[PDB]
Amino acid sequence: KVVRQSKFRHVFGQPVKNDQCYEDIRVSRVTWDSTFCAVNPKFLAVIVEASGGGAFLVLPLSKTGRIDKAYPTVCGHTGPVLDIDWCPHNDEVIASGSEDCTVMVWQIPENGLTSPLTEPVVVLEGHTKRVGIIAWHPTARNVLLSAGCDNVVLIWNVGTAEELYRLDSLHPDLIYNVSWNHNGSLFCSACKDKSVRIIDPRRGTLVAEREKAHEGARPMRAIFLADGKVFTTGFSRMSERQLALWDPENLEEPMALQELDSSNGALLPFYDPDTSVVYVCGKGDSSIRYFEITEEPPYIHFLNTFTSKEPQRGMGSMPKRGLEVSKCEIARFYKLHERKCEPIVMTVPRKSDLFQDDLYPDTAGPEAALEAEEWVSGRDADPILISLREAYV
Amino acid sequence: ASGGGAFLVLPLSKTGRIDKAYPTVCGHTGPVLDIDWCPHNDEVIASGSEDCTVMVW
Amino acid sequence: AALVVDNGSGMCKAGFAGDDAPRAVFPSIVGRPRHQGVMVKDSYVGDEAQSKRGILTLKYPIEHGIVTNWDDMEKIWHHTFYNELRVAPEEHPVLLTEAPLNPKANREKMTQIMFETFNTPAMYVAIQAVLSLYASGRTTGIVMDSGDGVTHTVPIYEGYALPHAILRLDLAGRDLTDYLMKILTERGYSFTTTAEREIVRDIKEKLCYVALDFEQEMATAASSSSLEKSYELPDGQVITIGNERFRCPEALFQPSFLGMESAGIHETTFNSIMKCDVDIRKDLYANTVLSGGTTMYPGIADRMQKEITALAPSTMKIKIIAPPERKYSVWIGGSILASLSTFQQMWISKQEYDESGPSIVHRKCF
Amino acid sequence: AALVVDNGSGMCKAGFAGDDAPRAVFPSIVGRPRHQGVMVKDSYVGDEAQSKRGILTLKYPIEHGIVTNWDDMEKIWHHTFYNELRVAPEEHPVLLTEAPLNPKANREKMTQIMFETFNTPAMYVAIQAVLSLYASGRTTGIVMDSGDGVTHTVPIYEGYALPHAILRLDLAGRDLTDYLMKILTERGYSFTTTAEREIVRDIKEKLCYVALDFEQEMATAASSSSLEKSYELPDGQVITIGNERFRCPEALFQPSFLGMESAGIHETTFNSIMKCDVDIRKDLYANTVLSGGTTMYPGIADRMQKEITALAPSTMKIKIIAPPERKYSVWIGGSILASLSTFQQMWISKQEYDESGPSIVHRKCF
Amino acid sequence: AALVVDNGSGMCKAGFAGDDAPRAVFPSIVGRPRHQGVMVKDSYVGDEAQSKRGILTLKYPIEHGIVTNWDDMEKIWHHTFYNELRVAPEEHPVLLTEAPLNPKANREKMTQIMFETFNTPAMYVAIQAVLSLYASGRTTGIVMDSGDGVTHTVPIYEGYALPHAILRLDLAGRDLTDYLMKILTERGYSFTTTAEREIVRDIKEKLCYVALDFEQEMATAASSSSLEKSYELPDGQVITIGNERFRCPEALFQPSFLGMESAGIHETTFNSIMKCDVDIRKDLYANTVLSGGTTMYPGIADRMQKEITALAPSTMKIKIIAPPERKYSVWIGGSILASLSTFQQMWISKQEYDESGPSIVHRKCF
Ligand SMILES: Nc1ncnc2c1ncn2[C@@H]1O[C@H](COP(=O)(O)OP(=O)(O)O)[C@@H](O)[C@H]1O
Ligand SMILES: Nc1ncnc2c1ncn2[C@@H]1O[C@H](COP(=O)(O)OP(=O)(O)O)[C@@H](O)[C@H]1O
Ligand SMILES: Nc1ncnc2c1ncn2[C@@H]1O[C@H](COP(=O)(O)OP(=O)(O)O)[C@@H](O)[C@H]1O
Ligand SMILES: [Mg+2]
Ligand SMILES: [Mg+2]
Ligand SMILES: [Mg+2]
């Protein structure tokens, strides 16, 4: 009718109190545009500035307030750490890419770190240039993706330190990001030649490709959605930041194409498949805009914008298993400043204090669906769904 | 009520101007919607409120 | 088809979004019979109360911008939807207007009545001073809105409001009507009833004006009969008034005529500009927008220009913008806003309000 | 028998050196009649203006620590000597108090009036922050003196002042009174006159407090009636306030409530310590002294302790010293100083001033 | 077509190599809104922030020569290339400038952004003091560069720099602006917001000067009105200042006015020459070059000549070289360097940086 039917038109962001923040954290000073922050329902990982080599700060979620300057960090890389990603099936396992052209997988003790962690579980050596892209497989166990600056994508089995697949002749220029699809059979990628590519790793073929998805020369991002579409952020020829929805079955024209502003800094999309809400956080921006991706035109529907007065250097997002369901919380973002990590709570205003069934469907669980040996054979499975009603208090 | 919900119970003899700080029955966290005295007990009253609860006093 | 309803202390302007003028403009009054019926309806609203006011006691549900009786306030809204506009309120989104620094308790009752009593599908509440700036095609300027209940000065710069600089004056049209009734007794005419308030208000809207120099105008009225005007009462009796024509609007600039300690509308506007940052005062001096019915006196813009020029520095350019349709500027700005494509994201649905409450209305609105 | 006069923007505290409390405490106001006398004194000062304020226009000669009218400033001093203390000023040496970083032109007028108008035999001007440190028996510590006009943070170490680290906040008691009037209109209570400003100030001194956690207190006030208090107006009418009790003092920690760009009193104190040498900050953290009437809110010391602890390093011991008599710490410290035997060398005689001028007052004083 | 970007703490000077003046000179500020928009861009850079500063909170991304926020530092560079010069940075080699004794971590971030974020084909970072010596046509002399953030004294002899004799003074243009705001409150003018910082900086650049003899100037200002100047604020209000004109730049020679323990710019320059070898001090006394906007006060060269002459031996010839374009000496010396033929061997290609890293930038550069 007059108002478009939705549940998230009034989602508002709220930063936590100062005692619930993480101060005195020397956030990294790397120009590479990653999230710098990786958070699971257990620990908070922030890429920090190490005096020598590379390191990132792993600290429990309870460890709030000012952090000791001599707090033990995960300092194992000889070059600055570029990307970090928690394992979706193990809250104590995190992979890290650095400028020393290697990927290291770490095991964090349950109570955190008491002494600095220098030796990892496995050192994955296969890239010739710096590794700035890391993405765990959503369903297959111990399957990790890494994409370096040598324009090659590698699929690893962390359990055996083996290289499952090498995809070198598919990206002619610098790779921006790599995002798996829902079940984990395909992954999309944005490249410096303004091309968005959909690739099947187990067959080494190019499923689909759209050349010049965005006309500008500034970086792009491309992520897969739950329904099987591609949401992209980029710049137009007039240096205007854009959002675009793509149908992989028909990439002639984008389903939607909206312009946001004319600011710099890449737009990092944070997709929530349970709510079909994409949170767009620009590097150097002070605002967070969220959009709802539906089937009704114009498909991309602007919800609202959380505004602040401090520009964000990084941004982490808490998965569904760590959110406070009893308070109608649908997203929590750990905004990184230059010396502080400030959690921001996204909440759906509801008069009721009971459990909201429509807000919290079954989310992906911490239990893997397949394994590395079964996924190589060609098996495809959906992520195992759990319930969030048990988390209600 | 400034916050939550309340209803004023005053004896029938208590006529005239009522004190602004006169004690009220303010146990609800939301505004009170309906009140009803017990037909078998002139000192028991039930109240419904926007906090989705029914309190008997 | 969105509805734009502008409820003031004296008049209720209502119509449809996209039009140029309100289709329904009627007094916001409720009249009740004060005699006993002897020949074989207990309340009248708006113009039907104005035509039977000889046997009615007239009450304004809004006094000084404050709703004194919400039961009579619902009669105004029910009369607006069903009698004046003749629409079903559950089929049209309604854009409402609110005074500056409006209490949240007042906005919650307005939102609760629209969604629960009239069952409107969508709703939004806009600030009246912002809508008056939409009608003039500006994003910067200080709006001096003087209606029937209260006077406000709201500075806005580049689309940003300065709430700490918003000043209020408990002196508007209804206080000038009561002052005209008082000084009309000095001439021999006695108006006391509520039905005679509407007669004096009609004398004020037709014969009163603002003098450029008050003391010179008082001297001209004392040595000549050129300023005298006649007015015909409903019963055919004709009255004549002289200096009361410009003495009544003079209370806007000298509130001491009413025993008030506050400053005039010219100093209230100047003091509101001085509460703003020094770097935006120059644009506020050149964009002083007048709004409301109490700004419809002949010669009020030249007097406002002269008084602020005497207060402001000599290098500032004082420019009083008084559009000829500023009596409906709030509604016209609402009809402009409710028709924009960028505004359709501001509607608050009835389904959203039932599950979330008035918290989504305190956000989204200002 | 030396006199100790503590003139502030709001209250004037006077008495005799050696006593434990000021003998005369009256508002620093001058009231003038705003009506016409019809039955067969053109100004009132202090408590006599506070008892006739219904027919007076009340003005403060000091605004934001700046004397706006020296004619009314001399009325306060004449009312102090002859009406309150009932002494002859030409027989007692007077110890005056001055704000930190006081302009020399302001100190010269103060010294000139005391010697030429009142003909005092001796005189001395002391810094209010230093006197507040005498009252607590310390030579090291940062004094946060918040009165009625302005707020200052003055660090002192081993009897040495650090003037480069003195910070000022144009936000004190009078700005909280004006903000309380603004948020009381959101509840249906209209206070607009200068006589009603003294009523709102009395509501603030009796019912306002500082919340330890502001957002938690807002949620408690929104779901309960336990935080609501009643207040009887001079005419018997009773008003009831809820969250306005802790929202008004919250502007001290969030000046953005007043549209101000500055920082709260907790960050102003922290920034003043950070402007000092690193080797003295440890003693300033453990000796934070509160002074003035604006520091008399219940729970302001625990909130000040909680906020500075979040800003300071974890190894520093934050200790807020809030004596229960800190409303008169400036006067008490002056009565202590004017009685010391090592102070009689600091008096400036009237004979010395007539032959030398204010240059001997700029020296000797700080 | 090589670009020459001169990024300082207060101003950003950019242009093309070969020209005689920077084409783009804008403030290095980032402004963000501090009010809520009420009418249907989250940051402003440079002059677009200076024109809307009334509703913005202005921040300098560089403080004391230290980048306090690199996200806002990139907004300055993006505004330089795309809004001021309107060029594509991937098509022009860019010559950057760095402060003396610049930390390598600061140069690595500057190089990493120009190659990865803006994708410049070539790049080079030069020392600001060496460029200021190119603009005057000298290979020997000590340059006293005083900008908005910090003051440096860099001795250079026959093209060889002496890093062990480079002295630094944490006192430049921004500290003088904050000191002028403090001593203006002594005259009755309150400037507190960041938007009023830019107003006081404009008063400083137009009315301030350096007195040859400070005590004689303080005596002339105390017995005459010849040194008083008026200044019109953006809102048309005119303020008058007297001795604050030469007291504010006096902090350059007496840092104790700011509570600082360091020595003045004259003793800092003399101490930097005495740290050099005895055989080169003679040419340094005769080639003292001034650079920066803080050296643009009227009479600063004669005062600098008078003070160093008193410190240096009587047989040395003190010669202060202050070119009338010394506000842009760093950029001019960069436009001269990037135009020479012997400089094309100093460019660092983007391909060389991607395969080698910042190690080739630590070498080649000084
Ligand atoms: N031509 C006029 N001259 C003087 N006053 C007028 C004129 N027209 C209307 N008014 C006055 O304006 C007041 C209300 O105008 P309006 O702006 O509609 O106020 P509100 O918004 O409170 O309804 C009435 O009291 C009326 O007396
Ligand atoms: N108990 C109290 N609680 C809160 N505020 C108070 C209290 N007592 C006094 N004040 C406030 O303190 C202010 C003046 O205190 P004081 O330090 O005496 O001012 P000054 O130093 O200007 O004379 C007044 O504005 C008054 O509102
Ligand atoms: N004519 C002038 N007189 C005095 N000071 C000036 C003048 N012009 C500029 N300044 C000051 O110089 C400072 C910046 O000069 P500049 O060397 O260009 O800065 P930076 O090199 O650090 O960007 C500013 O703080 C400004 O106040
Ligand atoms: Mg109106
Ligand atoms: Mg005081
Ligand atoms: Mg410079």
Swiss-Prot record, chain B:
How is the protein altered post-translationally, as described in the entry?
Answer: Phosphorylation does not seem to affect subcellular location.
WD repeat ranges are 20-57
What subcellular compartments does it reside in? Cytoplasm, Cytoskeleton; Cytoplasm, Cytoskeleton, Stress fiber
Q: Summarize the subunit comment.
A: Forms homooligomers, but does not form complexes with the other coronins. Interacts with Arp2/3 complex components, including ACTR2, ARPC1B and ARPC2. Binds actin.
Q: Into which family does the record put it?
A: Belongs to the WD repeat coronin family.
What is the stated purpose of this protein?
Answer: Regulates leading edge dynamics and cell motility in fibroblasts. May be involved in cytokinesis and signal transduction.
Q: What is this protein called?
A: Coronin-1B
Query: Which organism was this protein described from?
Result: Homo sapiens
**Gene giving rise to this polypeptide:** CORO1B
UniProtKB/Swiss-Prot annotation, chains C, D, E:
Residues modified as N6-methyllysine: 75
Care to name a GO molecular-function term for this sequence?
kinesin binding
Instruction: Tell me more from the record.
Output: In vertebrates 3 main groups of actin isoforms, alpha, beta and gamma have been identified. The alpha actins are found in muscle tissues and are a major constituent of the contractile apparatus. The beta and gamma actins coexist in most cell types as components of the cytoskeleton and as mediators of internal cell motility.
Query: Which reaction equations make up its catalytic activity?
Result: ATP + H2O = ADP + phosphate + H(+)
What GO cellular component is one of the record's annotations?
calyx of Held
**Cellular compartments annotated:** Cytoplasm, Cytoskeleton; Nucleus
Mutagenesis / variant outcome for changing residue 71 to A: Decreased interaction with SETD3
Function of this protein?
Actin is a highly conserved protein that polymerizes to produce filaments that form cross-linked networks in the cytoplasm of cells. Actin exists in both monomeric (G-actin) and polymeric (F-actin) forms, both forms playing key functions, such as cell motility and contraction. In addition to their role in the cytoplasmic cytoskeleton, G- and F-actin also localize in the nucleus, and regulate gene transcription and motility and repair of damaged DNA.
GO BP, sorted A to Z:
adherens junction assembly; apical protein localization; axonogenesis; cell motility; cellular response to cytochalasin B; chromatin remodeling; cytoskeleton organization; establishment or maintenance of cell polarity
Q: What is this protein called?
A: Actin, cytoplasmic 1
Please tell me, according to the UniProt entry, what happens when changing residue 64 to A.
Abolished methylation by SETD3
- Name the EC number(s): 3.6.4.-
Report the PANTHER family cross-referenced here: ACTIN (PTHR11937)
Summarizing the annotation, the consequence of altering residue 70 to E is: Does not affect methylation by SETD3
CDD domains recorded: ASKHA_NBD_actin
Domain of life, per the record?
Answer: Eukaryota
Subunit organization: Polymerization of globular actin (G-actin) leads to a structural filament (F-actin) in the form of a two-stranded helix. Each actin can bind to 4 others. Identified in a IGF2BP1-dependent mRNP granule complex containing untranslated mRNAs. Component of the BAF complex, which includes at least actin (ACTB), ARID1A, ARID1B/BAF250, SMARCA2, SMARCA4/BRG1, ACTL6A/BAF53, ACTL6B/BAF53B, SMARCE1/BAF57 SMARCC1/BAF155, SMARCC2/BAF170, SMARCB1/SNF5/INI1, and one or more of SMARCD1/BAF60A, SMARCD2/BAF60B, or SMARCD3/BAF60C. In muscle cells, the BAF complex also contains DPF3.
Give, from the UniProt record, the effect of changing residue 174 to W: In DDS1; likely pathogenic; results in reduced actin polymerization rate and increased depolymerization; results in higher ATP hydrolysis compared to the wild type; does not affect thermal stability; modifies cell response to latrunculin A
Q: Describe the family membership recorded for this protein in Swiss-Prot or TrEMBL.
A: Belongs to the actin family.
Q: What is the effect of changing residue 61 to A?
A: In BRWS1; likely pathogenic
Q: What is the effect of changing residue 137 to V?
A: In CSMH; somatic variant
Q: Which organism is it from?
A: Homo sapiens (Human)
Q: How is it modified after translation?
A: ISGylated.
Tell whether Transmembrane helix is among the UniProt keywords.
Answer: no
Impact when changing residue 355 to K: In THC8; uncertain significance; results in reduced actin polymerization rate without affecting depolymerization; has no effect on ATP hydrolysis rate; does not affect thermal stability
Q: Where is this cross-link: (Microbial infection) Isoglutamyl lysine isopeptide (Lys-Glu) (interchain with E-270)?
A: 41
